[PDB]
Amino acid sequence: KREHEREVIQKAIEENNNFIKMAKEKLAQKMESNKENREAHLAAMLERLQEKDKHAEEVRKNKELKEEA
Amino acid sequence: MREIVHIQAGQCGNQIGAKFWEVISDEHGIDPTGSYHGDSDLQLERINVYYNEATGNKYVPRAILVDLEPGTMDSVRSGPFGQIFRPDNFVFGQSGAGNNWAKGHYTEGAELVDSVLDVVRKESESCDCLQGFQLTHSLGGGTGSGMGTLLISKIREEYPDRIMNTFSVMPSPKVSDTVVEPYNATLSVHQLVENTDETYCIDNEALYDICFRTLKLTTPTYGDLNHLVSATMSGVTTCLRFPGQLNADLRKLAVNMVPFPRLHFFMPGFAPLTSQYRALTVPELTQQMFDSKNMMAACDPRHGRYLTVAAIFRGRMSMKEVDEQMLNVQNKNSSYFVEWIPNNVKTAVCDIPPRGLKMSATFIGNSTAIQELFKRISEQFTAMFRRKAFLHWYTGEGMDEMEFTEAESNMNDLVSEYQQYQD
Ligand SMILES: Nc1nc2c(ncn2[C@@H]2O[C@H](COP(=O)(O)OP(=O)(O)O)[C@@H](O)[C@H]2O)c(=O)[nH]1
Ligand SMILES: COc1cc(S(=O)(=O)Oc2ccc3[nH]c(C)cc3c2)cc(OC)c1OC
Ligand SMILES: [Ca+2]
Ligand SMILES: [Mg+2]
């Protein structure tokens, strides 16, 4: 009976510690996944905008080509 | 000197225990300070059974007050006879059991049980001949139910050759605090079956009905219910606390009342039911005593048979007439007593009556009809457990469903054992 009493209080501690561990890992995963996703969206937006600057630096390149002809 | 160590656990156990010490201190002429101010020396012949004598002719109860909350024990210390208990014997926690058997028995009470046993050991070491322990508690809460049974299990480990006695209050939907009371009661009953020698089954359903139907109280309070408990506890300890030609001790009661070790749950009864100037005759005491309306266990005796019966009459009366009326009950309703236990009814008479009564009688019955009480608890247990309702309160404390299933099986087995001796 004393052995069972130890096992019950040890099981209660294990399940409370596991609950704290599961929450800490779940939150760490979500915050890391969110940071990667949001950065990837901002990087994609800047990629399109920086590509537009490449197209702008190229349109001006065509006019300088034809004005000297 | 045959000393008894008293233990009270939980809200119900301490409130009922405090009233018990209040009642018997008056009967022995002990004031709230702890000094004797009586007249008859019969009040002190066996005062050592429940009291320890201190310096200056001071009498201190051999009581240990246990709770996981400080609230109820602060009320006792501020109560009428609060100053009579040892300050060292107040062992209490702070978190509480939350009406949870697991918290009392496994998690929260485990942190406190060792300190309680130190007080139990301190009291037992100073006993010339310790005959056993008596515990007052309820089975529907968490502290008296959970920790109380844990205390009983650990006390038996350290004192296996001593008598374990309990005054156990059964839960009832009529007077209910939480819906998980059947869970707590079923878990406690399995503990009591294995680890107690005598259990006085005090049913809150019976106490409510007596206050309502008989005493004519529309809204009974716990004080009203505890008044009945005080009268019963005083009656069932009369032979212990007062001299007689019987030399009554706990072990003798267990040997004669318990024909099979698991069937040690007694139906207490009292007469006259009080809440008042007319004296009661001996035939009236005997008729009310065996009346179901005076039973504290909410069971119909006519639905079962009496294995053994112990009756205590208090007051100045004709012992010749007492034997007439007791024999009249047996010879009349002989179908309600087992014929295979000859002379299974014992009668003792004490000249000192309780406070406020000229004549009183106390009934202690080991009836197989007590299975109705365990059937009632079992049915309320199963209705919830089949749907696993409220189980998370217990599994969150480390318990498993299997432990509940085992307790349910032991509960139903006890009913089966009581049933076979009814034929
Ligand atoms: N007769 C009686 N029953 C009580 C009293 N207090 C609580 N109860 C019963 O005991 C159960 C509640 O247990 P409680 O003592 O409060 O739990 P604990 O303090 O954690 O041990 C319920 O079924 C109540 O009906 C009381 O003073 N007298
Ligand atoms: C501590 O409580 C009591 C103890 C005793 S006893 O020590 O004499 O035990 C006996 C002896 C012979 C018996 N025959 C039967 C059928 C029961 C029985 C019990 C008697 C009591 O009242 C009758 C008690 O009630 C207050
Ligand atoms: Ca703690
Ligand atoms: Mg309570």
XYZ file of C-alpha atoms and ligand atoms in Angstrom:
548
model
C 0.000 0.000 0.000
C 2.882 2.384 0.743
C 4.358 1.588 -2.682
C 1.048 2.478 -4.345
C 0.895 5.762 -2.415
C 4.338 6.738 -3.717
C 3.350 5.812 -7.276
C 0.196 7.956 -7.177
C 1.961 11.106 -5.977
C 4.786 10.451 -8.449
C 2.255 10.056 -11.271
C 0.609 13.349 -10.285
C 3.979 15.123 -10.404
C 4.860 13.495 -13.733
C 1.593 14.584 -15.357
C 1.849 18.137 -14.002
C 5.469 18.436 -15.144
C 4.525 16.945 -18.515
C 1.720 19.499 -18.865
C 4.171 22.342 -18.216
C 6.681 20.806 -20.635
C 4.090 20.266 -23.382
C 2.866 23.862 -23.144
C 6.411 25.266 -23.176
C 7.338 23.247 -26.267
C 4.064 24.005 -28.070
C 4.469 27.741 -27.491
C 8.128 27.684 -28.544
C 7.181 25.873 -31.759
C 4.334 28.274 -32.555
C 6.376 31.425 -31.925
C 9.237 30.066 -34.036
C 6.910 28.979 -36.851
C 5.183 32.372 -36.778
C 8.484 34.273 -36.907
C 9.669 32.262 -39.915
C 6.336 32.684 -41.715
C 6.019 36.441 -41.177
C 9.643 37.024 -42.183
C 9.089 34.907 -45.301
C 6.103 37.073 -46.261
C 8.024 40.311 -45.687
C 10.966 38.899 -47.654
C 8.633 37.993 -50.525
C 7.142 41.499 -50.523
C 10.600 43.085 -50.597
C 11.674 40.677 -53.350
C 8.873 41.862 -55.645
C 9.589 45.511 -54.815
C 13.323 45.067 -55.407
C 12.483 43.347 -58.696
C 10.427 46.416 -59.641
C 13.518 48.562 -59.053
C 15.403 46.222 -61.390
C 12.691 46.773 -64.006
C 12.897 50.535 -63.405
C 16.692 50.528 -63.768
C 16.171 48.589 -67.022
C 13.493 50.825 -68.572
C 15.844 53.787 -68.125
C 18.569 51.655 -69.721
C 16.472 51.318 -72.885
C 15.838 55.061 -73.260
C 19.550 55.853 -72.921
C 20.112 53.256 -75.660
C 17.693 54.859 -78.140
C 18.351 58.546 -77.401
C 21.970 58.214 -78.575
C 20.922 56.474 -81.812
C -5.439 2.067 32.870
C -7.000 1.403 29.450
C -6.468 4.685 27.601
C -8.048 5.665 24.281
C -6.471 8.079 21.793
C -9.075 10.238 20.044
C -8.460 11.634 16.554
C -10.714 14.026 14.632
C -10.052 14.869 10.984
C -11.690 17.331 8.616
C -14.514 19.802 9.074
C -17.133 17.212 10.030
C -14.742 15.200 12.187
C -13.627 18.220 14.200
C -17.092 19.753 14.630
C -18.532 16.398 15.703
C -15.435 15.645 17.774
C -15.561 19.027 19.511
C -19.190 18.454 20.494
C -18.290 14.986 21.796
C -15.641 16.421 24.120
C -18.037 19.193 25.134
C -20.695 16.637 26.102
C -18.529 14.182 28.040
C -16.524 16.904 29.807
C -19.840 18.059 31.266
C -20.706 14.472 32.222
C -17.356 14.072 34.011
C -17.553 17.544 35.578
C -14.663 19.068 33.607
C -14.943 22.802 32.930
C -13.543 24.432 29.763
C -10.363 25.259 31.705
C -9.793 21.567 32.445
C -10.426 21.439 36.198
C -12.765 18.948 37.855
C -15.818 20.547 39.484
C -18.149 17.572 39.887
C -19.716 15.832 42.867
C -19.604 12.060 42.323
C -16.288 10.213 42.366
C -17.764 7.944 39.677
C -16.918 10.791 37.275
C -13.190 10.188 37.874
C -12.901 6.408 38.337
C -12.219 5.893 34.612
C -11.464 9.497 33.647
C -8.068 8.331 32.333
C -9.728 6.503 29.414
C -10.168 9.776 27.508
C -8.289 12.344 29.630
C -4.667 12.926 30.614
C -4.031 14.387 34.066
C -1.693 17.385 34.049
C -0.012 19.444 36.757
C -2.371 21.051 39.246
C -5.103 18.400 38.887
C -5.790 19.504 35.303
C -7.557 17.122 32.907
C -6.639 17.410 29.220
C -8.392 15.301 26.547
C -6.288 12.660 24.807
C -7.453 14.165 21.524
C -5.600 15.029 18.321
C -7.114 17.628 15.990
C -6.211 17.165 12.318
C -7.257 19.145 9.252
C -5.786 20.288 5.951
C -7.462 23.706 6.451
C -7.012 26.064 9.425
C -10.636 27.252 9.401
C -12.527 24.605 11.367
C -9.764 24.120 13.942
C -9.635 27.873 14.564
C -13.356 27.663 15.343
C -12.725 24.808 17.788
C -9.918 26.702 19.527
C -12.311 29.664 19.826
C -15.217 27.404 20.801
C -16.648 26.779 24.269
C -14.172 24.069 25.339
C -11.405 25.203 22.989
C -8.910 25.932 25.766
C -9.014 22.321 27.013
C -7.081 20.680 24.155
C -3.297 20.517 24.027
C -1.858 23.240 21.760
C 0.671 20.666 20.525
C -2.187 18.422 19.351
C -3.409 20.955 16.759
C -1.865 19.582 13.551
C -3.186 21.444 10.515
C -2.272 22.409 6.970
C -3.122 25.370 4.781
C -4.031 24.190 1.279
C -7.007 21.972 2.109
C -8.365 18.832 0.483
C -11.013 20.456 -1.738
C -13.595 17.742 -0.961
C -11.257 15.368 -2.810
C -10.370 11.916 -1.484
C -7.164 11.774 -3.545
C -5.907 15.065 -2.103
C -6.521 13.846 1.440
C -5.129 10.361 0.882
C -2.361 10.729 -1.714
C -1.096 14.262 -2.391
C -1.992 16.885 0.217
C -2.493 14.656 3.262
C 0.732 12.764 2.590
C 2.633 15.976 3.358
C 0.912 16.222 6.770
C 0.375 12.623 7.917
C 3.858 12.143 9.410
C 3.504 15.110 11.769
C 0.139 13.745 12.943
C 1.680 10.356 13.768
C 4.276 12.110 15.937
C 1.456 13.454 18.111
C -0.185 10.012 18.063
C 3.129 8.475 19.127
C 3.584 11.110 21.843
C 0.149 10.302 23.276
C 0.540 6.520 22.953
C 3.949 6.460 24.667
C 2.410 7.988 27.813
C -0.329 5.324 28.071
C -0.136 2.601 30.711
C -2.186 0.221 28.535
C -3.348 1.663 25.215
C -6.458 -0.207 24.101
C -6.926 1.520 20.754
C -7.881 4.615 18.802
C -11.184 6.233 17.885
C -11.577 8.486 14.845
C -14.366 10.949 14.063
C -14.707 11.948 10.416
C -17.007 12.097 7.420
C -16.575 9.965 4.314
C -17.914 12.437 1.740
C -15.232 15.118 2.022
C -11.519 15.025 1.349
C -9.658 15.406 4.643
C -11.606 13.227 7.070
C -12.371 10.825 4.230
C -9.022 10.707 2.427
C -6.484 11.586 5.105
C -8.478 9.880 7.855
C -8.325 6.514 6.105
C -4.642 7.137 5.361
C -4.110 7.796 9.075
C -5.959 4.583 9.944
C -3.781 2.606 7.525
C -0.560 4.083 8.931
C -1.694 3.780 12.557
C -2.440 0.090 12.003
C 1.081 -0.341 10.618
C 2.599 1.102 13.804
C -0.021 -0.303 16.233
C -1.271 -3.538 14.622
C -2.377 -5.061 17.952
C -4.592 -2.102 18.946
C -8.296 -1.617 18.255
C -9.275 0.788 15.477
C -12.679 2.404 16.057
C -14.389 5.038 13.906
C -17.431 7.288 14.013
C -17.951 7.631 10.258
C -20.543 10.033 8.840
C -22.055 8.784 5.577
C -22.934 11.326 2.864
C -26.477 11.835 1.626
C -28.000 13.861 -1.229
C -30.429 15.293 1.343
C -27.486 16.968 3.129
C -24.866 17.320 0.393
C -21.883 19.593 -0.227
C -20.510 18.215 -3.512
C -21.625 15.717 -6.147
C -18.402 13.698 -5.726
C -19.394 12.544 -2.240
C -20.251 8.994 -3.471
C -16.728 8.784 -4.922
C -15.176 9.797 -1.597
C -17.485 7.523 0.411
C -16.897 4.424 -1.733
C -13.123 4.911 -1.592
C -13.256 5.351 2.191
C -15.555 2.367 2.811
C -13.058 -0.025 1.222
C -10.422 1.337 3.607
C -12.744 0.906 6.603
C -13.579 -2.699 5.660
C -9.919 -3.716 5.937
C -8.476 -1.425 8.617
C -11.126 -0.861 11.319
C -12.458 -3.163 14.026
C -15.652 -1.179 14.722
C -17.320 1.541 12.646
C -20.395 3.401 13.878
C -22.281 4.206 10.666
C -23.771 7.670 11.165
C -25.955 8.499 8.161
C -26.625 12.164 7.434
C -29.826 11.056 5.697
C -31.011 9.499 8.962
C -29.964 12.540 10.998
C -31.842 14.842 8.618
C -35.011 12.729 8.760
C -34.908 12.574 12.569
C -34.527 16.355 12.766
C -37.265 16.854 10.167
C -39.861 14.118 10.713
C -39.437 13.528 14.456
C -37.950 16.663 16.034
C -40.145 18.832 13.747
C -37.395 21.094 12.397
C -38.161 22.611 9.000
C -34.573 23.656 8.170
C -32.107 21.499 10.132
C -28.602 22.907 10.471
C -25.394 20.958 10.986
C -25.657 21.933 14.647
C -29.006 20.149 14.814
C -27.536 17.057 13.152
C -24.478 17.141 15.423
C -26.719 17.266 18.505
C -27.921 13.764 17.615
C -24.316 12.653 17.087
C -23.281 13.968 20.513
C -26.061 12.026 22.240
C -25.139 8.856 20.343
C -21.388 9.175 20.926
C -21.955 9.789 24.635
C -24.220 6.738 24.784
C -21.919 4.335 22.928
C -18.981 5.350 25.149
C -20.897 5.184 28.447
C -19.530 1.743 29.331
C -15.993 2.941 28.578
C -16.199 6.168 30.592
C -18.207 4.961 33.592
C -17.592 2.073 36.002
C -19.688 -1.070 35.840
C -19.559 -4.779 36.534
C -18.709 -5.391 32.865
C -15.145 -3.978 32.626
C -15.988 -2.807 29.125
C -13.162 -2.235 26.649
C -12.971 -1.811 22.887
C -11.576 -5.301 22.238
C -14.398 -7.035 24.130
C -16.938 -5.074 22.088
C -15.244 -6.142 18.845
C -15.016 -9.816 19.837
C -18.706 -10.126 20.714
C -20.197 -7.756 18.111
C -18.238 -8.836 15.015
C -18.813 -12.474 13.953
C -16.989 -11.968 10.634
C -14.139 -9.450 10.306
C -15.547 -7.510 7.339
C -19.021 -7.136 8.903
C -18.112 -4.602 11.583
C -20.387 -1.683 10.628
C -22.827 -0.924 13.441
C -26.211 0.791 13.372
C -26.384 3.272 16.278
C -29.669 4.210 17.881
C -30.752 6.551 20.647
C -33.848 7.176 22.766
C -35.504 9.494 23.645
C -34.873 11.698 20.593
C -34.294 15.218 21.917
C -33.756 18.620 20.329
C -38.891 17.422 27.330
C -39.963 17.376 30.987
C -41.843 14.053 31.038
C -39.925 11.056 32.346
C -39.725 8.063 30.015
C -40.609 4.603 31.302
C -38.447 1.550 30.639
C -40.936 -0.010 28.153
C -40.983 3.288 26.243
C -37.176 3.400 26.075
C -36.980 -0.138 24.692
C -39.708 0.406 22.088
C -38.158 3.627 20.774
C -34.661 2.114 20.897
C -35.482 -0.683 18.442
C -37.717 1.645 16.410
C -36.332 2.426 12.962
C -37.143 6.122 13.469
C -34.458 6.236 16.194
C -31.766 4.620 14.026
C -28.854 6.783 12.874
C -28.056 4.706 9.761
C -31.196 5.258 7.613
C -31.805 1.518 7.260
C -34.936 -0.477 8.030
C -34.037 -3.203 10.570
C -37.068 -5.252 9.494
C -35.483 -5.534 6.024
C -32.618 -7.545 7.531
C -31.646 -9.527 10.626
C -29.638 -8.583 13.700
C -26.367 -10.469 14.040
C -25.476 -8.944 17.422
C -27.038 -6.175 19.518
C -25.587 -4.135 22.394
C -27.921 -1.914 24.425
C -27.051 0.665 27.092
C -29.647 2.061 29.502
C -28.809 5.210 31.471
C -30.524 6.486 34.605
C -32.030 5.182 37.818
C -34.410 2.415 36.756
C -35.487 -1.131 37.570
C -32.882 -3.513 36.165
C -35.525 -6.213 36.640
C -37.840 -4.253 34.338
C -35.038 -3.625 31.821
C -34.476 -7.370 31.456
C -38.240 -7.829 31.078
C -38.499 -5.370 28.187
C -35.294 -6.496 26.461
C -36.412 -10.135 26.591
C -39.846 -9.035 25.362
C -38.326 -7.496 22.216
C -36.266 -10.606 21.457
C -39.095 -13.069 22.098
C -41.569 -10.948 20.118
C -39.508 -10.095 17.017
C -37.351 -13.232 17.074
C -37.515 -13.367 13.264
C -35.281 -10.262 13.126
C -32.445 -11.886 15.111
C -30.210 -14.653 13.787
C -30.996 -17.991 15.414
C -27.431 -19.294 14.925
C -25.845 -16.846 17.393
C -27.347 -17.692 20.810
C -27.810 -14.808 23.256
C -26.755 -12.163 20.729
C -28.281 -9.245 22.688
C -26.274 -7.631 25.499
C -27.703 -5.106 27.957
C -25.772 -2.820 30.303
C -27.197 -0.251 32.722
C -25.471 2.902 33.984
C -26.881 4.918 36.877
C -25.571 8.282 35.623
C -27.923 9.738 32.984
C -26.918 12.253 30.299
C -27.320 15.982 30.812
C -30.976 17.001 30.606
C -32.473 13.486 30.575
C -33.679 11.351 33.470
C -33.814 8.189 31.332
C -31.995 7.361 28.102
C -31.101 4.304 26.043
C -28.435 3.824 23.369
C -28.589 1.126 20.690
C -25.635 -0.515 18.912
C -26.716 -2.972 16.238
C -24.802 -5.141 13.769
C -27.696 -5.622 11.355
C -27.438 -7.017 7.836
C -29.879 -4.260 6.810
C -26.878 -1.893 6.785
C -26.341 -3.218 3.251
C -29.053 -0.750 2.204
C -26.697 2.090 3.140
C -23.872 0.611 1.065
C -26.325 -0.166 -1.743
C -27.411 3.484 -1.725
C -23.806 4.718 -1.879
C -22.947 2.160 -4.565
C -25.871 3.193 -6.786
C -24.906 6.871 -6.567
C -21.287 5.917 -7.309
C -22.115 3.820 -10.377
C -24.441 6.422 -11.915
C -21.488 8.818 -12.221
C -18.663 6.327 -12.769
C -20.347 4.654 -15.757
C -19.935 8.008 -17.530
C -16.558 8.750 -15.868
C -18.088 12.023 -14.680
C -15.955 14.236 -12.408
C -13.151 11.647 -12.607
C -10.651 14.273 -13.779
C -10.585 15.732 -10.258
C -9.034 12.424 -9.134
C -6.926 11.412 -12.137
C -5.307 14.847 -11.929
C -4.084 13.855 -8.458
C -2.415 10.677 -9.749
C -5.271 8.191 -9.386
C -6.314 5.702 -12.066
C -9.722 4.421 -13.142
C -8.744 0.927 -11.968
C -8.651 2.066 -8.333
C -12.255 3.262 -8.587
C -13.271 -0.036 -10.210
C -11.627 -2.000 -7.393
C -13.370 0.154 -4.775
C -16.694 -0.402 -6.552
C -16.094 -4.169 -6.577
C -15.166 -4.215 -2.885
C -18.268 -2.139 -2.129
C -20.527 -4.591 -3.970
C -18.749 -7.570 -2.390
C -19.485 -6.160 1.070
C -23.168 -6.014 0.119
C -22.969 -9.630 -1.066
C -21.389 -10.685 2.232
C -24.113 -8.935 4.236
C -26.742 -10.514 1.966
C -25.714 -14.148 2.477
C -26.108 -13.934 6.273
C -29.687 -12.658 5.857
C -31.127 -16.073 4.938
N -23.363 15.417 10.578
C -22.495 16.321 10.066
N -22.067 16.148 8.792
C -21.201 17.019 8.226
C -20.727 18.162 9.013
N -19.889 18.852 8.217
C -19.831 18.203 7.025
N -20.622 17.117 7.031
C -20.805 16.148 5.924
O -19.516 15.719 5.483
C -19.404 15.829 4.067
C -18.412 16.947 3.792
O -17.166 16.558 4.355
P -16.184 17.596 5.094
O -16.076 17.272 6.563
O -16.627 19.026 4.891
O -14.808 17.256 4.326
P -13.339 17.541 4.915
O -13.331 18.728 5.846
O -12.410 17.803 3.754
O -12.866 16.306 5.642
C -20.785 16.159 3.540
O -21.430 14.949 3.132
C -21.518 16.747 4.725
O -22.888 16.346 4.697
C -21.239 18.283 10.398
O -20.887 19.227 11.135
N -22.094 17.350 10.836
C -17.410 -0.144 24.536
O -18.781 -0.400 24.257
C -19.429 -1.431 24.913
C -18.714 -2.553 25.345
C -19.362 -3.594 26.005
S -18.411 -5.001 26.532
O -17.034 -4.560 26.751
O -19.036 -5.620 27.701
O -18.421 -6.024 25.261
C -19.427 -6.960 25.042
C -19.605 -8.097 25.883
C -20.610 -9.009 25.612
C -21.417 -8.758 24.489
N -22.501 -9.515 23.982
C -22.979 -8.841 22.829
C -24.137 -9.368 22.038
C -22.236 -7.718 22.623
C -21.252 -7.654 23.657
C -20.227 -6.731 23.935
C -20.736 -3.520 26.237
C -21.454 -2.400 25.808
O -22.816 -2.293 26.020
C -23.584 -3.495 26.060
C -20.810 -1.352 25.145
O -21.586 -0.274 24.751
C -21.297 1.021 25.285
Ca 2.688 21.185 -0.814
Mg -16.613 21.412 3.925
